[PDB]
C-alpha cells in the first residue's frame with residue numbers, strides 16, 4: 001500500500017513539476033508592460049498644420 | 053532559439069512564445085473589407101482591416117471569419133491573418149522560429165496539408181508541427197489520463213485519453229459550438245423586439261451572450277421561475293444607448309448545448325456525448341475517465357456549467373462511480389498553455405517536421421510518422 | 424548459500440528462498456504489450472509490462488500468458504518473466520544461487536531441455552534441478568505415500584506414490600484445469616446478458632469465478648433448487664459499477680471438473696480418473712492410496728470439493744475401504760512449500776545439475792541420472 | 795493595488811487546492827484499505843466456520 | 852472589473868478551504884477505522900492459528 005501510494009505520488013509530483021517549470025520559465029518575464037502615458041495634461045502646445 | 057506556439061482556433065487567434073504563462077497577443081480572427089464608397093481623399097484607407105483593428109471600425113466593414121468549423125474555407129484570408137499575427141502582433145520574422153499549430157480532430161486532410169505547405173513556402177519557417185487541440189488541454193491540467201471536452205467556438209470535440217495512449221475509436225466530434233449559440237441567441241432576441249441582422253451586430257450579440265447568459269442547473273424550474281417573478285431580467289446598454297432587458301433568454305441560449313434539438317440538430321447534448329465517448333472505451337479504464345473529466349475551450353466558461361454537467365453525468369453513470377469535473381479558472385487559454393508546455397519539452401525537440409524532410413516528401417509528410 | 428525455489432506454474436509464478444513457509448513474491452505470469460497509439464510524450468511508456476504491473480494497466484494492454492498447458496509456447500516472453508522474477512521481485516542476482524524449477528508430468532522433452540539451457544546460458548546459475556510438481560505436493564503434506572491430484576491452472580495430473588516409489592505407469596494427466604473453467608464460465612455468463620470478450624475481461628471473469636463459484640454436493644438437487652427459489656443468486660460489482668447477479672452459473676462452472684463433457688472433452692471427471700489411477704496400481708497398495716488421497720493446486724480450492732470428491736470415490740470404491748481426502752488449508756502453495764522442504768534437505772544437496780556437468784554433456788543432461 | 799490583491803488571492807487558492815487534492819488522495823487510500831480489511835474479515839469467518847464443521851465431525 | 856474578480860476569487864478560495872477541511876475530517880475518520888481494521892485482522896489471524904492447532908491434534 002505504501003509503495004503504491006509513493007509511486008503514484010511521485011508520478012503526480014513529476015507531472016506537476018513539469019507544469020511548474022513551464023510556469024517558471026515564462027510567467028511575467030515579458031509580462032504586463034504598461035507602455036502608456038500620463039495623458040500630458042500640461043501640454044499646451046498646439047499645431048496649425050492641417051495637410052496631414 | 054524559442055518556438056512560436058500559435059493556435060489558430062476559430063474566433064480568437066492566440067499566440068505567444070513557448071515557455072510563458074499566457075498568450076502574448078489575443079485578437080479576433082476576422083478580415084473585413086470596407087463596403088461603402090469613401091469620399092475623403094488621402095485619409096489612408098486600407099483595403100482590409102484584420103484582427104483587432106476591424107473590431108473598432110466594424111461600423112463600416114463586413115467582417116467575415118476565415119474559419120467556419122475548424123476547417124479553413126478561405127485560404128487567402130487565413131494567410132493574411134497569419135501574416136498579421138507574425139509581423140505586427142509579435143514582430144518576429146518567421147525565418148528564425150519553429151511553429152506549433154493546432155488542429156481539431158477528424159478534420160479534412162487537405163486543410164492540414166495546405167496549412168503546412170503555406171507555413172513552409174510563404175512564411176518559410178524552419179520547422180512546424182501540428183498537434184490535436186485536446187492533448188494540449190490535457191497537458192495544461194498536469195494530468196496524464198482523463199477525457200477532455202474542448203468546446204471551442206467552432207467545433208466541440210471530446211477526446212478520451214488513458215495513460216498517454218489516446219483511443220482513436222472513441223473521439224466524438226460535434227459541430228455545435230459558440231458560433232451556433234450566438235446565432236441562436238440572435239434568433240431568440242427577436243421575440244422581444246430587438247433585431248440584429250448585420251454581420252457587425254453579431255459581435256454585439258456575442259458580447260451580450262458573454263456578459264449575461266448562464267447555464268441553468270435545472271431547466272424546467274428556471275423556465276417556471278422566469279415566467280412568474282422578474283428577478284432574472286438583467287439589462288444591458290447597447291453601443292449607442294437604448295438599454296435592453298433580457299428575460300428568460302439568459303439561460304435558454306446556452307441550454308442548446310445540452311439539447312441540440314433547439315437549433316434543429318439531431319445529436320445529443322454535450323452531457324450525453326461524453327458518456328457515450330466513455331462507454332466506447334474499455335471496461336477497465338472507465339472509472340479513471342469518470343473521475344478525471346476535463347473541461348476546456350472558451351464556451352465552457354458559462355457560469356454554472358460545471359455543476360449542470362456533473363449532475364447530468366451522475367444521472368447517466370452508475371451510482372457507485374465518482375464523477376468529478378475539472379474546471380480550471382484558466383479554461384480559455386488551456387490549449388495554448390498546454391501548447392507552450394509541450395513546445396518547451398526536451399523530449400519533444402526531435403519531433404518537429406524539419407524543412408529538409410518536407411523537401412524530400414512533399415506536404416504529405418504531415419500524415420507520416422511526424423504526425 | 425541459499426537456493427532459489429522458483430515454480431513457474433501457469434497463471435501464478437510463485438518464488439522465494441528455500442527454507443521459509445510461504446513464497447516471497449506471487450504474481451500473475453502475463454506479458455502485455457500496449458495496443459493503442461499513445462499521444463503523451465515523455466510519459467515513460469515501456470514496451471511490455473510483465474507480472475503484477477500489467478494487472479493494473481490492463482485496460483490498455485493485450486495480456487497473453489506465455490504458458491498454455493504446462494508446456495511453454497513463447498520462449499521470449501518466458502525469459503522476460505524469469506528475468507523480472509529474479510531481478511525485481513527478489514532482487515538477487517542468479518549468479519550466486521541454485522534454482523529448483525518445477526515441471527508437470529508427461530511434458531515434452533524439448534520444453535525441459537530449453538528451460539535448462541536458458542537457466543545455464545542466459546541467467547548463468549550455478550546449478551539447477553527440475554522436479555515433478557506432484558512429488559513436492561506430497562512432501563508438503565509430510566506423508567510418504569498417497570495419490571496426489573494436483574489440479575493447477577494449466578493442467579490437472581494425478582501421480583500415485585507408494586513408500587517413496589513412484590509408479591510411472593499410473594500417471595493420468597488431463598488437460599482440463601482452471602483456465603478452461605474460466606473460459607466456460609465466460610461462455611455461460613452470456614446466458615444472462617453479460618458479454619466479456621476482451622483478453623482483459625478474462626481477468627474479471629476469473630475474479631468472479633474465484634469469489635463466487637462453489638462445487639455442489641449433488642448436482643441435480645442444486646439445479647432443481649436454483650430453478651425454484653432465489654436463495655443462491657449472489658451479486659457482484661464490476662470494476663465500474665453495474666452489479667451483476669449470478670444464478671445457477673455458480674455451481675455449473677466448477678461442475679465441469681466432474682463432467683468434462685460440458686466443454687466437449689471426452690474424458691472422465693477428476694472423480695473417476697483418480698479411481699482409474701488407483702486401479703492401475705498393484706492390488707496390495709490400493710488400501711493405502713485410498714486412505715491417503717491428497718489434494719493440491721489452486722483449482723482444488725472451491726468451497727465444497729473435498730466432500731463431493733469423497734462422495735464420488737466412495738460410490739466408486741469397494742464398500743469396505745476407508746476413503747479419506749487430505750485437503751490442507753495451504754493448498755495453493757503446497758507445491759512451493761514442498762519445494763522449499765526438498766531444497767532444504769542435506770541428502771538432496773548432491774543431486775543438483777552442476778554447471779561443469781552441463782558443459783560436458785549438453786542440455787540433454789536433464790534426462791540422464793540427474794533427473 | 796486591486797490587481798495585486800487578485801494575484802495574492804490566486805496564490806492562496808492554488809496552494810489550498812494542492813492541500814485539498816492531497817487530502818482526497820489520502821482518503822482514497824484509506825478507502826481501499828478499509829475494503830481490504832472487510833475482505834479479510836469475511837475470509838477469516840468463512841475458513842473458521844469450515845474448520846468448526848470439520849472439528850465437530 | 853478587478854474588484855468583482857477579487858470578490859469571486861476569494862469566493863472560490865473559501866470554497867476550496869471548506870472542502871479541504873471536510874476532506875481532512877474524512878481522512879482522520881478513515882484513519883481510525885483502518886487501525887480498527889488492522890486489529891480485527893490480527894485477532895482473526897490468532898484465532899486461525901489456534902483452530903488449526905486443535906484440528907491437527
Ligand SMILES: Nc1ncnc2c1ncn2[C@@H]1O[C@H](COP(=O)(O)OP(=O)(O)O)[C@@H](O)[C@H]1O
Pocket residue numbers: 060061062063064065203204205206230231234258261262263349350351353354384
Ligand atoms: N466569458 C465567456 N463566457 C461565455 N462565453 C464565452 C466567454 N468567453 C468566450 N466565450 C465564447 O467562446 C468563444 C471563444 O472560444 P475560443 O476558446 O477562443 O475558441 P477557439 O477554440 O477557436 O480559440 C467566443 O466566441 C465566445 O462565444
Ligand SMILES: Nc1ncnc2c1ncn2[C@@H]1O[C@H](COP(=O)(O)OP(=O)(O)O)[C@@H](O)[C@H]1O
Pocket residue numbers: 431432433434435436574575576577601602605629632633634720721722724725755
Ligand atoms: N480461492 C480460489 N477459489 C477458486 N479458484 C481459485 C482460487 N484461487 C485460485 N484459483 C484458480 O486457480 C488458478 C491458480 O492456480 P495455481 O495453483 O496458481 O496454478 P499453478 O499450478 O500454475 O501455480 C487460478 O487461475 C484460479 O482460476
Ligand SMILES: [Mg+2]
Pocket residue numbers: 061062185202204205349350387
Ligand atoms: Mg480551441
Ligand SMILES: [Mg+2]
Pocket residue numbers: 432433556573575576720721758
Ligand atoms: Mg501447480
